């Protein structure tokens, strides 16, 4: 009913109407949601930073991600996913930021969480809501749907 | 030598695993296509951990530490502000290898009247940068797709053995 650049157009007039800007933080899709954000002709009035990061390490490091948080509830939980969230966040200065991990697939997390697993967080102005998910499909069909996702829930948010 | 973006990212991804590389990117112009490129290969865990995609001047600045006077003494698309965008990135990943794009993809120019089409790149090999400056023809995803597979194929000619 709605394609992603349907969502990328409806959300792009919604935030510039706002004046609001957006960032991304993906441990999953890989680029993908930045790729969809950008492809919208006026990109640039509301969205500057988007993040891929794949390890651990690197979310601790860039992310601020507290180690804890990763031994009590690994990468893949919502509770890692509010710390990205709102870490990118600041470090763009944005007012939006949208955070995704999760096992894309074809391997599951060593926890044995099923692979499309994938966890999500809008933080809007430090509000943040999250979501947990479970998508059927090869590693392709789990990074489209949880794009879609994340851009589909952060238009309802933006009623 | 006619490759597409999956060969040359598949190429790519055995002469990194079999140095133990480990390669970071910076976009300002491809929007996370080059991202996207390094995430679909089979191995991409093994090699590629952060992608940084960036539009505006100021988030340059912030993030990658591109220097005020740099940015406006030869502007974004520059091999000076790229050769910092990658030097940056390197050492936020903590990467051997980094490539930075920054480029007009179109349909505007530059200000200062640089054609649409004209990209900046930047490869830092552990520690010594290549850059090189290319006008590419077409519209904005024409010239996003030429850049994406010629940051790649220029890096696996950079690390081939037929290089002289
Ligand atoms: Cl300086
Ligand atoms: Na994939
Ligand atoms: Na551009």
């Given at each position: 009913?709605?394609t992603?650049?349907?969502?990328?157009?409806?959300?792009?007039?919604?935030?510039?109407?706002?004046?609001?800007?957006?960032?991304?933080?993906?441990?999953?899709?890989?680029?993908?949601?930045?790729?969809?954000?950008?492809?919208?002709?006026?990109?640039?009035?509301?969205?500057?930073?988007?993040?891929?990061?794949?390890?651990?390490?690197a979310?601790?490091?860039i992310?601020?991600?507290?180690?804890?948080?990763?031994?009590?509830?690994?990468?893949?939980?919502?509770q890692?996913?509010?710390?990205?969230?709102?870490?990118?966040?600041?470090?763009?200065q944005?007012?939006?930021?949208?955070?995704?991990?999760?096992?894309?697939?074809?391997?599951?997390?060593?926890?044995?969480?099923?692979?499309?697993?994938?966890?999500?967080?809008?933080?809007?102005r430090?509000?943040?809501?999250?979501?947990?998910?479970?998508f059927?499909?090869?590693?392709?069909?789990?990074?489209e749907?949880?794009?879609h996702?994340?851009?589909?829930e952060?238009?309802?948010?933006?009623?």
């Amino acid at each position: 009913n709605n394609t992603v650049g349907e969502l990328t157009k409806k959300l792009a007039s919604k935030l510039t109407d706002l004046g609001l800007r957006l960032t991304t933080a993906e441990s999953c899709t890989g680029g993908k949601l930045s790729v969809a954000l950008c492809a919208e002709e006026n990109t640039a009035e509301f969205y500057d930073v988007g993040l891929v990061v794949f390890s651990d390490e690197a979310k601790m490091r860039i992310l601020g991600v507290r180690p804890e948080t990763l031994e009590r509830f690994t990468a893949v939980s919502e509770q890692t996913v509010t710390e990205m969230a709102a870490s990118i966040r600041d470090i763009a200065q944005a007012d939006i930021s949208i955070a995704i991990s999760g096992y894309a697939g074809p391997e599951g997390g060593d926890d044995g969480t099923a692979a499309g697993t994938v966890c999500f967080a809008w933080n809007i102005r430090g509000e943040t809501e999250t979501r947990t998910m479970l998508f059927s499909g090869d590693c392709q069909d789990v990074v489209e749907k949880a794009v879609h996702f994340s851009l589909a829930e952060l238009l309802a948010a933006l009623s």
